[PDB]
Every structure is written in C-alpha cells, then in structure tokens.
Design a protein around this ligand. Structure first.
Ligand SMILES: Cc1cc2nc3c(=O)[nH]c(=O)nc-3n(C[C@H](O)[C@H](O)[C@H](O)COP(=O)(O)OP(=O)(O)OC[C@H]3O[C@@H](n4cnc5c(N)ncnc54)[C@H](O)[C@@H]3O)c2cc1C
Ligand SMILES: Cc1cc2nc3c(=O)[nH]c(=O)nc-3n(C[C@H](O)[C@H](O)[C@H](O)COP(=O)(O)OP(=O)(O)OC[C@H]3O[C@@H](n4cnc5c(N)ncnc54)[C@H](O)[C@@H]3O)c2cc1C
Ligand SMILES: O=C(O)CCC(=O)C(=O)O
Ligand SMILES: O=C(O)CCC(=O)C(=O)O
Ligand SMILES: [Zn+2]
Ligand SMILES: [Zn+2]
Lengths: 467, 466
C-alpha cells in the first residue's frame, strides 16, 4: 500500500491555535469526524482527527500559515461528492471544509457576473441567480451538495456543458489561498482581461493540490425564455448516433443538452427509485433539452426534428414536455442513475472520453468478458461531449473482477487515444493511471508546478499526480 | 530600456542554425527590415538574424542551441500585435512561424482542427468553411495573423460574444520550451481532466513561456444563416438599450454586437474611402446573428428591428444576408484600427469597463483635451465590455502623453477595469499592470517565468514588470 509521508501530527497546541483562528469552527469529536472521513462511494475512509470550518478567506490564510510552519497536511473538502477519492484523507490530514464559506458577495444584474464564496452550494446558487433570471453555466446531479469551489477545483463538466462549455471559460476570477497562507487575488470579475498570465487557470482542475479556492467570480448565462425536453427510445446505438447528428442539424443553436442511457440504466432507476418509463421499452434512451429565446420557434424546430427522427426510424417512441414539473420528471431519469447504481451494489466506475462513434463498444465488450460475475454493466452519459460513464455493479467487490477490468479498460481507452478521466478528475483513485492519457514530460511539468506552489506538499498529499 | 547580458550571434552560431534549418536562415539586412518593425511602426529592432523553421523538431533544436549559448529569441507570428511584443528591442533572434503553415488533421464530424502555429487565420477559415465549419474566433487582422499568435496573445475578437475564449475553444497545444524540451499537450478531446490543464499557461503567455508550434482547436459548425444589421443610434443611452433589447429578443442567435462613434465613421470614410450605408448618427451598432434556421432568424430580426425603430432607439438601419453586403458592412467596423493609424499618431488604450459607463471616458477625454488632440474616438466589443479608446494627433506630443497617462489607467483602475482587455501586455504595457493586477499575482507570474525559462531567453523585456 501507500506509505504515510513524514508530516507532523496535530497537538493540543495546534487545536488551541485553530480555536483562536476560527472560534467555534473546530470539530474534534471522533463520531462527528466519521462522516467527513468517508468518501461519497463509501469505499475510502480517512483517519483525520480534526475538521476546521472557517467562515472567511483570512481564516483560511491563517490556518494554512500555521499548517505550513508546523508541517501539517491539509485535505480540502467541499460538498464531498467527488468520485475519485480526492475529497477525504488517506491518513490523518486535517479536513478543511468550506461548508461555512457560503456567502454571495455580489451579483450584477446586467453583466450576469456572480461573485461568491467557494462553499456556496450549486443548487442554492442556481436558486439565487434564477430568481434574477440568470442560470449557472453548469449543472450536475450533485447540485444539491457540491460546492462551487469543488466544481472549480475538479473542473466539473455536467449536463449543460454542451451549451455553455468549460469552467476554464466561464470562471472569470478566483481568490486562492496558497499552501504557505499567501492570498492570491486573481478575482477579476471582468469578461476580458489580458493583463499577464491567466494564473487562475492553474487552479481549475487542480483538485486542491496547488491552493484552496476561497472566492469565485463566474459568468452566469441568462435564463432561457423557453425550455423543452424530449425523451426518446432508440432501437440501437447507431440510431442514437444518427439521432444526435439529426438533432444538431435541425435544432442547432437552441440545443442545451444531449444525454443517453441504456436499457439497464432505465431498469435500475425504475427498480430502486420507482420511476416508471414514459416511453416504450427500448435498448437505448436519449434525453434532449433545448433552451431558447422564442418558444414558438423552438417548438417548430423540435416538431420538425421529431417528425423526421420518427420518420426515418431513428426513434421508435418519444415524449415531449414544457411543463416545469414534467421536465423535471424526465430529467430525474437521467440525473439519478448514479444513485441507483450505488444502491445496486458495489460499483466499479469509469469516466471516459472516447470517439463518439465508438462510445458504447466497451460496454458490449465488458458484458461479454465479464460473465455472471458482474451483477450489471451499464453505459450512459454526455454523448454530445464524447463522455461515457461506464459502471459495473456486483454484490461485493472482488479482486478477480478488478483484474478483468484493469488495466483492460485503460488499455482500450489508450488504444482509442481517449481520456481515462473525462470530468471526475484524478484524486486518490486514478493518480497512477495518468500515463494512458498524458505523456511523461507533461506529468513532469505538473510535478514542477506542485513543487513551486507547495514545496512542503501539505495540500492533499497522495493525490492527484503520479507517485 | 537597457540590454540584458545575452551572448551575441557569431559566425559559428549562423553555421549551426544553417545545419538545423537549411534554407531558413535569413541575414540580408534589407530583408530583416520589415520583421524588425512592429505593426504600428513605433518600435524598430536591430535583429540581424531571422530563422524560419518548418517543423517542431527544428524549433526544438534551435531553442536547445539558444539555451546552451544564452541567445535571446523573439518568437514572431503575423506581426500584427499591437503592444510591441512581436519585434525585438535589441538583438534577439527572430524565430518566425511563417513556414509552419500545414494543416495536420481535421475531423469532419467533431469539428476538431489540428494545425501548425503559423497557419494564417483567414486561410484556416477558408479551409474549415469549405468543410462547413468556422473558426471560433475572428479579428480584423485575419489576413495576416497566425493561429499561434492568436493563442499566444489570447486574442478575443469579433465572435467572442458567441464562441467565447480560446481558453475554452483550444483543446490542445504542442509547445517548445526555452531549453528545447517539447511539451506535448496536443490532445484532441473535448473533455480531459487527467491532471493540470497545462496548456492554459501558454494561452496569453505571449511567447515568454514557450513557443507554440501546434494547435488543436474546436471549430463551431458553419451557420446556415448569418445576418448583419448596421444601425445608427442617436446617443450612447440608446446604444445600451439597443444592446439590452437585442439580447432579450435575439438571444442565442446573437454572434456579434459592435459599436463605433461618429468620428470613427468619418475616419474610415476619409482615409479608407468607405461610404456609410445609413444616415449620419452620433453612434453606430453592428449586430450579427448566426443560426440554423434562416426563417426563424429572419423573423427574430424583423421583430427586433420593428421594435427598435418603433421605440426610437435606432434612427436609420440597413440589414444584409447576402455574403457580399455582409462583408461590406463588416468592413466599416473591421478597418477602424487602420483608418485610425492613417489619421496621424495614435495613443491606443484597450480597456474592459462596466458596459453602462463604457463611453464616459471618451467624453471625459474630449473635455479634458480641448483642441490639443486631433480626434478622440471610442469603438469596439460593447457586448464584452471592451472599449478601444484612441486619441489621434497630427504628431506625438509629450504634453498630450502627460495628459493621457497615468490618467486613463487611473480611471480604469477606479472602475476595477482592465488596462489591456485584448491586445495584451508586450513591451508597451509591462509597467502598467499594477492598475489591474495586485503584486502577489505579478510575483507568481515572475516565478512561473523563472521556472519555465530561467535564462530568460524567450521574449526579454516583455511581458512582466521590469
Ligand atoms: C450524483 C452525482 C453526480 C455527479 N455528476 C457529475 C457530473 O455530471 N459532472 C462532473 O464533472 N462531476 C460530477 N460528479 C462528481 C463531481 O466531481 C462532484 O459532484 C463535484 O465536482 C465536486 O464538488 P464537491 O464540493 O463535492 O467537492 P469535494 O468532493 O468536496 O472535493 C473535490 C476535490 O476538490 C478538492 N477541493 C474541494 N473544495 C476545494 C476548494 N475550495 N479549493 C480547492 N480544492 C478543493 C478536494 O480536495 C477534492 O480533491 C457527480 C457526483 C455525484 C455524487
Ligand atoms: C486590423 C487589426 C485588428 C485586430 N483586431 C483584434 C481584435 O479584434 N482582437 C484582438 O484580441 N486582437 C486584435 N488585433 C491584434 C491581435 O493581438 C493580433 O492581431 C493577433 O493576436 C495575432 O497576432 P500575430 O499572429 O500577428 O502574432 P505576432 O504579432 O507576430 O506576435 C504577438 C505576440 O505573441 C508572440 N507570439 C507570436 N507567435 C507566437 C508563437 N507561435 N508562440 C509563442 N509566442 C508567439 C510574439 O512574441 C508577440 O509577443 C488586431 C490587429 C490588427 C492589425
Ligand atoms: O455515475 C457516475 O459514474 C458519475 C456521475 C455523473 O458524472 C453523471 O451522472 O453525469
Ligand atoms: O484599434 C484598436 O485599438 C485595435 C483593434 C481591434 O481589436 C478591433 O478592431 O476590434
Ligand atoms: Zn457526468
Ligand atoms: Zn478588438
């Protein structure tokens, strides 16, 4: 296994220092530390003995200043919805939670620029801006728990990426506390600014190994006047791909989401969350969302799209909704697959970028390679972006299944020149599989960046660079 | 201001470069004149060596030699940069991407383009448009600028409102570092969270951290319908309401919103002989839309125009969908920078400001500088909060400089604005970044420069403070 690096340990004097620095924000009770020590999948557990909950950036600066002088390792944590073990300690790293850094600083109702603390919950930010007729540029099934700071640190993708793009584009600025407690102010709430190096980009997707994000400035799209959702059954993956092509050709700029899921996903969502399918049983399903300025025009585009899709046999059955309640009901069938999977058993999880034409091949392969040893194998996700969520469920973890899955899935993916972690990131789980997607010189430059910014390595050790 | 202690090019260095890039060592003094002068013709280097590599390996071997020999290197693209970043100050070797102009691949379904850094933007637009795709950026310099230069400066431009930043649209980069090390970040995937997004360091790094040799970029689909409305507005308040209504009524099809003042129109007419298509107005707005259903777009433009004329926001307007008339209208905006440089000496500021007060500095400068300036103009990417502010005089005046600076930079800082929205920093603005960046940021920038290029051979005297 992995060996604990020679960091110091938390003393009573350290506890008293933290009580001085964040009054009422020091949690030491072992039973209270249980939950923050366990990851979302419940397959990794740390042994942290202290949780710190600052309210302000200055408090984070002072905490890290102390940890730097004392050589104490720190595990930043947001919503703890991460999928790659990055969010919980390996040994006894201090858990630094942003839960109480949850204030909105400002919102400009013309530019649509939001500035808020890192621990603001995504769904809550959505409620805040939507009250003002804007939306967040990203959305994901974790919205109820994930923090904007976590989203920036992981460079989260999600359900509207196809329309609004990367956080590398929509984040306008960051305030970041470095490992020695230096406050880096890159919080330029401006749409455009070419005044030197774009330092904030370094912290988007860096997963807390280069600094702790404390404040975010983000560009919020305007709220669409008209939202439509279509939910369609396709008789094969080829028809899914042609449905995508036709969808881009006929809906065009109003397209805001394209998601697929297979028959097994639908069966599991029905079985564990009791959500009935609104279309005839099909081997594949597709959820399409549109967002636009003119209801009538979007309706015409969608109507012609559906007529043509059903006409050429790409879709066997379909349903449409504009009512907010029904739209949300349709979205639940896609959003809650991940929950249903973790209720089905032990989950082997893979998050892959592949050539869209070959996105589902691995699922067929694994269904054949694995026998009755897999309880289920599923594929679903952000097909428009080339992103497959591959999952295998079983009654319990097994070394034999792991040996069948790995390195086979990663070698297949490298064979397709794909990404072994499209959006979820690296963290603890994937730190040793980056060679399938990144050349050695890049990994070395990443290590040099880490050495520059955190020479003591107190921020999220054992992640998210190779050993 | 003062030359750093770099080596000098010897005869043996020339023979080495001839070995590395045979045919690509230009030493003719008359041939070196043009690459030593920046686009504005206000900076002039004294470089005696231009190298024109063809491949990434040639670049790698050149920089390896320059690192061992401590020779300064000035990367150069199309030489359309505006901040003196693209030409030597003293005797840096000019490394041109002019011959690195091949397309390597283009996926006709995903729209992913892989090309060498020296491909000219216009030529790439032609290439991908023949295949029903477009570049995610466009600028008035399209005819000369290289994709490598666009990435190195993080160019914004005329369709930024729709497709956004190169920070979002660039998918991969091959970069050659100061010691010759080839950094491969040339992925062609839309989504890849396998470590740090290293390529981001080089977008906007202006050749001080590495030389971009290959670009992978996501091309948007080519629109079925492009419309342009060129409108005359009777004041800036009405410009702002035209913008607000435009967003409410056009929405997702909007691909451009540019503005210009009256003096700009007069200067393009006077110096470029381009006639106005609408009545004389104090302000002009160019709106472009791009969509997949030409009839829906046309209906949206109709309702928008009818309401804008009806509510008095616009006085006179012309619309165009024919490609020729679209290009005619676009020329009135695209060529303002050229018309300005033909009016005399140009004091050029490129600011990000709150949109609601984007033009206030123009009126302030017109009152502050009475008859001592020839013209003060404001135009540019209003949708993105970016004002191009220019003052022309028949000749440069130290008086007029003292009136403009630091005043303009102080006003911008008072608005928490950017003193270089688009064009970057280069040589001209290296010592005015404090108006937009705090000292800790600039310090970290210097630490990254020191990590990636400890000898400082890549683009000295730029683009960090002295
Ligand atoms: C049901 C479900 C659906 C999901 N859907 C998606 C999806 O569509 N797309 C997608 O990309 N991901 C998705 N995810 C995973 C995604 O990574 C998380 O939902 C989210 O991005 C992490 O936010 P968090 O606040 O929970 O971060 P955490 O799990 O708390 O932490 C994530 C990582 O960032 C670090 N970190 C946390 N806060 C900070 C900070 N302030 N500064 C610096 N580093 C910090 C942590 O150390 C850790 O390494 C999903 C997860 C679930 C459970
Ligand atoms: C008429 C006109 C209109 C313009 N409009 C706009 C506009 O709308 N928006 C906008 O943002 N800019 C605009 N610009 C300026 C813009 O910054 C440049 O035109 C553009 O970025 C391309 O630069 P280039 O190819 O000429 O590079 P160069 O000028 O040759 O170089 C620019 C800088 O980048 C460096 N560099 C160049 N190539 C490389 C490389 N391969 N690797 C590393 N470093 C490199 C150089 O050292 C220098 O510092 C305009 C310019 C003109 C003349
Ligand atoms: O279930 C998974 O593999 C991850 C969840 C996710 O990213 C999604 O639901 O889109
Ligand atoms: O004229 C200027 O200030 C620069 C050119 C430019 O970026 C523009 O024409 O949009
Ligand atoms: Zn996902
Ligand atoms: Zn411009």
């Amino acid at each position: 296994p992995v060996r604990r690096l020679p960091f110091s340990t938390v003393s009573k004097q350290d506890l008293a220092a933290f009580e001085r620095i964040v009054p009422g924000g020091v949690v030491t009770d072992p039973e209270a530390l249980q939950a923050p020590n366990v990851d979302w999948l419940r397959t990794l557990r740390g042994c942290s003995k202290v949780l710190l909950r600052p309210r302000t950036s200055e408090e984070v600066s002072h905490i890290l200043r102390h940890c730097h002088e004392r050589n104490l390792a720190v595990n930043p944590q947001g919503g703890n919805t991460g999928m790659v073990g990055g969010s919980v300690p390996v040994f006894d790293e201090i858990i630094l939670s942003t839960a109480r850094m949850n204030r909105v600083l400002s919102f400009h109702s013309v530019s649509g620029i939001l500035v808020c603390q890192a621990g603001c919950v995504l769904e809550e930010l959505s409620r805040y801006v939507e009250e003002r007729d804007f939306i967040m540029p990203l959305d994901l099934g974790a919205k109820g728990s994930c923090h904007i700071g976590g989203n920036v640190a992981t460079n989260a993708g999600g359900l509207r990426f196809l329309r609004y793009g990367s956080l590398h584009g929509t984040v306008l600025g960051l305030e970041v506390v470095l490992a020695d407690g230096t406050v880096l102010d890159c919080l330029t709430s401006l749409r455009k600014d070419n005044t030197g190096y774009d330092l904030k980009q370094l912290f988007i997707g860096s997963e807390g190994t280069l600094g702790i994000i404390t404040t975010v400035s983000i560009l919020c799209p305007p709220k669409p006047r008209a939202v439509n959702v279509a939910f369609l059954g396709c008789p094969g993956f080829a028809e899914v791909l042609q449905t995508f092509s036709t969808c881009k050709g006929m809906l065009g700029e109003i397209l805001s989401a394209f998601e697929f899921m297979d028959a097994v996903c639908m069966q599991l969502v029905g079985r564990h969350l009791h959500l009935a399918s609104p279309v005839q049983e099909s081997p594949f399903y597709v959820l399409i969302e549109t967002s636009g300025s003119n209801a009538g025009h979007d309706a015409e585009k969608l109507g012609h799209f559906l007529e043509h899709a059903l006409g050429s046999g790409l879709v066997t059955d379909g349903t449409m909704a504009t009512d907010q309640r029904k739209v949300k009901m349709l979205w639940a069938l896609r959003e809650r697959i991940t929950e249903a999977l973790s209720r089905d058993g032990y989950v082997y999880k893979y998050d892959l970028s592949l050539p869209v034409e070959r996105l589902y091949d691995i699922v067929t392969d694994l269904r054949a390679r694995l026998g009755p040893h897999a309880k289920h194998v599923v594929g679903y996700g952000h097909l428009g972006d080339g992103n497959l969520h591959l999952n295998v469920t079983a009654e319990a973890f097994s070394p034999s299944l792991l040996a069948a899955l790995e390195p086979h899935v990663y070698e297949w993916t490298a064979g397709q020149q794909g990404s072994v972690s499209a959006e979820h990131g690296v963290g603890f789980r994937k730190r040793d599989v980056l060679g399938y997607s990144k050349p050695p010189g890049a990994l070395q430059l990443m290590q040099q960046l880490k050495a520059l910014l955190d020479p003591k390595g107190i921020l999220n050790p054992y992640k998210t660079l190779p050993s």
